[PDB]
Design a binder for these strands. Structure first.
Length: 94
RNA sequence: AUUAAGACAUUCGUGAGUGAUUUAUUUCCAUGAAGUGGCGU
């Protein structure tokens, strides 16, 4: 299981659209590795990892030129899960 | 010409007087104006 963000950024570069930044999207847990390229001959698992810690709808991706943006918008694909409050609670007492 | 004849059960007379469709009853019960951040390790 890997990122939905890296999931998203993979297809934007599948056509010519250069995103701002100097380092490729992260693979692997550790080390300073970079991979703007194929994962591996076998394949990779992509799931909406960030849904469980608070569902999000619209993702702005900063194109190289400020002039435009690129937007990814998320929907339940069957109109069931339109919400998820973050399953974490922050309590500040004294 | 005969125990006959004669005689409107009629006159007068308000179905009227008194009397609230009123009394009692919560438009109320349940319900988070809330959720999420995104972008260049």
């Amino acid at each position: 299981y890997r990122w939905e963000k890296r999931k998203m950024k993979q297809l934007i570069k599948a056509r010519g659209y250069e995103l701002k930044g100097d380092h490729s999207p992260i693979s692997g847990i550790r080390e300073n590795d970079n991979s703007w390229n194929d994962p591996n001959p076998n394949g990779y698992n992509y799931a909406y990892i960030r849904a469980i810690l608070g569902l999000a709808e619209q993702y702005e991706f900063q194109l190289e030129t400020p002039y435009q943006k690129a937007i990814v918008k998320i929907k339940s694909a069957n109109n069931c899960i339109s919400r998820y409050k973050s399953p974490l609670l922050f309590k500040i007492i004294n």
